Design a protein around this ligand. Structure first.
Ligand SMILES: Nc1ncnc2c1ncn2[C@@H]1O[C@H](COP(=O)(O)OP(=O)(O)OP(=O)(O)O)[C@@H](O)[C@H]1O
Ligand SMILES: Nc1ncnc2c1ncn2[C@@H]1O[C@H](COP(=O)(O)OP(=O)(O)OP(=O)(O)O)[C@@H](O)[C@H]1O
Ligand SMILES: [Mg+2]
Ligand SMILES: [Mg+2]
Lengths: 394, 49, 384
């Protein structure tokens, strides 16, 4: 009824928002700064207080000390090296050698110790964040879930049942099978359930251009790993990071093997990782090096194969629990139609079988819609199917 | 003019730079030959276009 | 700026009137609320007084820096352009949220303290691999296929335009789409009509140009590529001719196939990684479907497998009609003799014959295209 009367009384106050919010001050869209209404702590005091008494305190690196006296030996980025001193504010206790310290530009004396270098590409592969994958969602391989989970979390959640019994729990475990079987998807439930540092590693990210370059990245990874008390290190697709040593004639695949040898050394030998648990997963395990496959590094050895019948029916009940369907279908018929089949294929059949109901104008799929999925996904894509030379893992 | 050269030549040297591009509030981003980039100002006698 | 997200009556109602009237009174409250602050606290201008107080803090030689760590109590280690890094402190006008390792910041000339942060001048490659405009005409340009086009809209376009249908079904769209057949069968040509149709950020990459001469530069290029694809929007990543990573060996690659392998491994991660993927679609196309690794082709990585057959002859006449649509055809010709000339001609062949025939007319300055133009034209196009 009041067509313009709602529109302009709308519009003059939608504008009058901005017409006084410019008179507040949010404006002068910047080049990298902050809101003018926020910074006013450093306004009259820290502008000459966090600035004018404050130094630059250029950071350095300690070489070593000497006896009887401080007479410290400093080192900087490019320039020369000095004999330097502490400040009074610090003890000479935590002034150990090979340490970064904040140092004045004039007297060249030590102010505060610093943490060492972390190499932030290693920092990036800390995940910081958990996925949503439930152990309810990897149903069908519950014995593998149990046999893994009894290794992964049970000392971390209960470090007393192993101690008072008097056994040290294992540290290493690989997971392997054909692709799409639930290896990576299974790892996501661990990264879900967990709490500590979950540092993921994909081996092809270690492929470097320089020599020894990934090998130091390994070292740093174990440095910040040894900083944390308990830490879980994830290894995905480790066939890139190493099969074995086979060298003959011109040195082929030399560079990868040395990093693999560093990975051996960081795993076993001379006061090791302690409370750092590892977890590999491959596709084809047959390529892998035997000393890598030595226990003490890769103790638990979990297989992932296809489910028998009931795990498959359970996977039907996993992906199929949340879709509009005919009420009176049965899945055991479909599992009979899927002998050699992964749960990814089961999910793909679920998602295609919905699309059949999406084809004309149906809301819920039927049994024969599922049958329309079966021949296409199973039997029409049967030229590809990707599995059988991975069943033998070649 | 000629006596003035004894004085004005006491002025120090002038840097040479390289514009990447300008930003807001009469400022530009300029990098030296082998020396890092700077966000600096303009004088009044220089137009932004 | 994001003051009220509610529009739901969408009529002439006292609801939508009272909305604004309420927010009218609130915005007048903000106006005369701030109005008294300068009335009884002039004391400054506050529009440039505190602002040029900040600009009187920060010096004009603003050195450009780069982060490498963060200690929360407004000081950190920051790297110089020379490399000799410091341990300066950070200001209060730095709006401490846009601070990530490796970012460009603004430093003092004197104490090199963290003045401000710097917006990053994009990336040369993002624009290079980023497709700007729609290439060409719509799906009506193609003709003859009419089935898999429904497949492509099904997996791609309909998820975009109608996100109601998957939700009433209790389902998500299929992930990976692949295209394979004989060469010159319109494989790229369909993707052009997709790039016409979509509004999403579109990326296109040949499978040939993945390979490098540096070790790991391929997989690094992959990781930053999927970084670019994820960081933008509902994006469409297209790959053409992915077999070329397996077919041809080049001596620019220092590594052999056991670097190509690692490249395909990192890509193989980026299809089916444990990380939250987001809204990126993957369209692939080649002609040698039997050659590559089937591990990339597993469901979970690719859901839809789309073959392109050779054209049948009643579709051929349609393709002739398309490639002869706007041209001044002299009526000397019969297209049906042109259909059965080759039994297995492609859609590239028809357009090659048509365009080359136009070249033959432009040899003789003519405007219409006669029969012998086609007669010697197919001699040029086919037989050599
Ligand atoms: N037991 C299962 N239950 C439900 N879904 C499964 C199961 N196993 C696999 N899937 C499906 O397989 C897809 C891929 O899982 P995952 O990435 O773990 O495969 P994988 O075994 O790690 O092989 P690859 O390393 O090649 O990925 C997931 O999207 C998931 O839907
Ligand atoms: N069905 C068709 N209708 C109209 N034109 C076609 C058809 N098929 C092919 N063409 C013409 O052939 C040209 C080649 O198309 P396109 O490159 O997409 O085929 P392709 O199979 O991708 O080729 P390649 O195998 O070399 O990648 C297109 O520009 C198109 O005009
Ligand atoms: Mg996986
Ligand atoms: Mg093509």
């Amino acid at each position: 009824t009041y067509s313009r009367q709602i529109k302009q009384v709308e519009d003059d106050i939608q504008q009058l928002l901005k017409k006084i919010n410019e008179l507040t001050g949010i404006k002068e869209s910047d080049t990298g700064l902050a809101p003018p209404a926020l910074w006013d702590l450093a306004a009259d005091k820290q502008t000459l207080q966090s600035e004018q008494p404050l130094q630059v305190a250029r950071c350095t690196k300690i070489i070593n000390a000497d006896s009887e006296d401080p007479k410290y030996i400093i080192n900087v980025k490019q320039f020369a090296k000095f004999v330097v001193d502490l400040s009074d504010q610090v003890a000479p206790t935590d002034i150990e050698e090979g340490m970064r310290v904040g140092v004045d530009r004039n007297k060249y004396q030590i102010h505060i110790p610093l943490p060492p270098k972390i190499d932030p590409t290693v920092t990036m592969m800390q995940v910081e964040e958990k996925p949503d994958v439930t152990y309810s969602d990897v149903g069908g391989c519950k014995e593998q879930i149990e046999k893994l989970r009894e290794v992964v979390e049970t000392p971390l959640l209960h470090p007393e049942r192993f101690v008072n019994l008097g056994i040290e729990p294992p540290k290493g475990v690989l997971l392997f099978g054909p692709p799409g079987t639930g290896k990576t998807l299974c790892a996501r439930a661990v990264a879900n359930r967990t709490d500590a540092c979950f540092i993921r590693v994909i081996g092809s990210e270690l492929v470097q251009k320089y020599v020894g370059e990934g090998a130091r990245m390994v070292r740093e990874l174990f440095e910040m790993a040894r900083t944390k008390k308990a830490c879980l290190i994830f290894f995905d697709e480790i066939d890139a990071i190493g099969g074995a040593r086979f060298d003959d004639g011109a040195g082929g695949d030399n560079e990868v093997q040395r990093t693999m040898l560093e990975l051996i050394n960081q795993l076993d030998g001379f006061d090791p990782r302690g409370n750092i648990k590892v977890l590999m997963a491959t596709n084809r395990p047959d390529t892998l090096d035997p000393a890598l496959m030595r226990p003490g590094r890769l103790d638990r050895k979990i297989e992932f194969s296809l489910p028998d019948l009931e795990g498959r029916t359970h996977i039907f009940k996993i992906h199929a629990r949340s879709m509009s369907v005919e009420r009176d279908i049965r899945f055991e018929l479909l599992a009979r139609l899927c002998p050699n089949s992964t749960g990814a294929e089961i999910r793909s059949v679920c998602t295609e079988a919905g699309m059949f109901a999406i084809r004309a104008r149906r809301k819920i799929a039927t049994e024969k819609d599922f049958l329309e999925a079966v021949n296409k996904v199973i039997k029409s894509y049967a030229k590809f199917s990707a599995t059988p030379r991975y069943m033998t893992y070649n | 003019l000629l006596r003035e050269e004894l004085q004005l030549l006491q002025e120090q040297g002038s840097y040479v730079g390289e514009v990447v591009r300008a930003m807001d509030k009469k400022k530009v981003l300029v990098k030296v030959h082998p020396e890092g980039k700077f966000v600096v100002d303009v004088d009044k006698n220089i137009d932004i276009n | 700026a994001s003051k009220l997200p509610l529009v739901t009556p969408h009529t002439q109602c006292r609801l939508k009137l009272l909305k604004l009237e309420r927010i009218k009174d609130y915005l007048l409250m903000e106006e005369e609320f701030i109005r008294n602050q300068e009335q009884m606290k002039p004391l400054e201008e506050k529009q440039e007084e505190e602002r040029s107080k900040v600009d009187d803090l920060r010096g004009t030689p603003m050195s450009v820096g780069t982060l490498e760590e963060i200690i929360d109590d407004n000081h950190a280690i920051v790297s110089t352009s020379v490399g000799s890094e410091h341990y300066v402190s950070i200001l209060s006008f730095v709006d401490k949220d846009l601070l990530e390792p490796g970012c460009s910041v603004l430093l003092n000339h004197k104490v090199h303290a963290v003045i401000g942060v710097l917006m990053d001048d994009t990336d040369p490659l993002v624009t290079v691999m980023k497709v700007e405009k729609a290439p060409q005409e719509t799906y009506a340009d193609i003709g003859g296929l009419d089935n898999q086009i429904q497949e492509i809209k099904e997996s791609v376009e309909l998820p975009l335009t109608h996100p109601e249908y998957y939700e009433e079904m209790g389902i998500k769209p299929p992930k990976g789409v692949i295209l394979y057949g004989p060469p010159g069968t319109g494989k790229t040509l369909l993707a052009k009509a997709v790039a016409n149709q979509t509004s999403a950020t579109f990326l296109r990459v040949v499978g040939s140009e993945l390979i490098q001469k540096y070790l790991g530069d391929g997989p690094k290029l992959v990781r930053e590529l999927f970084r670019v694809a994820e960081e933008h929007a509902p994006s469409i990543v297209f790959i053409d001719e992915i077999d070329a990573i397996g077919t041809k060996r080049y001596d620019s690659n220092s590594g052999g196939e056991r670097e190509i392998q690692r490249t395909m491994l990192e890509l193989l991660n980026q299809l089916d990684g444990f990380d939250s993927r987001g809204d990126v679609k993957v369209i692939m196309a080649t002609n040698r479907i039997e050659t590559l690794d089937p591990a990339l082709i597993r469901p979970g990585r690719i859901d839809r497998k789309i073959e392109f057959p050779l054209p049948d002859e009643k579709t051929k006449k349609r393709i002739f009609q398309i490639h002869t649509s706007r041209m001044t055809l002299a009526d000397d010709v019969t297209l049906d003799d042109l259909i059965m000339a080759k039994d297995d001609l492609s859609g590239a062949d028809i357009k090659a014959i048509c365009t080359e025939a136009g070249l033959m007319a432009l040899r003789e300055r003519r405007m219409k295209v006669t029969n012998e133009d086609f007669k010697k034209s197919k001699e040029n196009v086919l037989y050599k």
